[PDB]
Amino acid sequence: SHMGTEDLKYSLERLREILERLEENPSEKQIVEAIRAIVENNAQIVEAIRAIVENNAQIVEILRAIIEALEAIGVDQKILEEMKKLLKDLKRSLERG
Amino acid sequence: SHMGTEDLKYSLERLREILERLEENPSEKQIVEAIRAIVENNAQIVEAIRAIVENNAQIVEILRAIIEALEAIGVDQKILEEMKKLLKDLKRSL
Amino acid sequence: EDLKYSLERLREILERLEENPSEKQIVEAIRAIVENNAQIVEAIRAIVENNAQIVEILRAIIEALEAIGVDQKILEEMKKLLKDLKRSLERG
């Protein structure tokens, strides 16, 4: 279970610990242990990015609903147009799965 | 081509397989194998982040447009200064 | 921004390791990775803090729309979407 970016700081600090332990008394098993740790840190980095991406997708949904609110109340299409173009573009260049 | 975060998931599983093999039977060839796959998974991560940072600035520009519209149509100055301050306190952090 | 340098540095070190695997090279690569992962975590951290400020801006925006008199239907829609973002938001 990924809980937040503190998972990333804790797994990074553990990796820094292994690193100094490696450079002090190098050894193959220490090298494998560093790689093991790197994989744990990377697995948590990936989990964070997936969350952030879903987050931004959900932000786009809120932004679309907001544009609808402004339209449902009679705001000028002159104004809505610029917002609709920017959101269209963002929806195109959005990082997704 | 970076297609999305599914790339990160796919390069990560690959690195995990390499790691299991390395751990059941270590070897110098697999250690370099793993380090190569780490640089790969990391390159894609840097690609996703790059894309997220550009996405984020696009989101902020849309927020500014929304707030500028709100002012145009006569929202109250209390909430208006409240939103403009949030944007300024974001502009600092960036 | 400075994420680039940390990745390029790491890809050049990978070359030197590719040609003549040494304990020196391997350890250099790992340290270079740690630095790259350090930059990557820091970038993610900044992004996560900024999205929590984006959430607050969205809340205030929804309040300005309710204040002006947006229909309950679209309003509830917006309130539900932000509640869902708040619940799934990446944080510390």
Residue numbers in the entry:
A (entry chain B): 0 to 96
B (entry chain C): 0 to 93
C (entry chain A): 5 to 96
Q: What's the publication's text?
A:
We used de novo protein design to generate very closely related proteins that adopt two very different states—a short state and a long state, like a viral fusion protein—and then created a single molecule that can be found in both forms. In the compact “short” state (∼66 Å height), the flipping helices fold back to interact with the inner helices; in the extended “long” state (∼100 Å height), they extend to form interactions with each other.
The interaction energy between the flipping helix and the inner helices in the short state was tuned by combining hydrogen bond layers (“A”) or hydrophobic layers (“X”) in different orders in each of three possible positions. Designs were given three-letter names corresponding to the layers in order, starting at the hinge proximal position. We also designed for structural ambiguity in the turn—with the result that the secondary structure prediction for residue 75 is mixed helical and coil, but with low confidence.
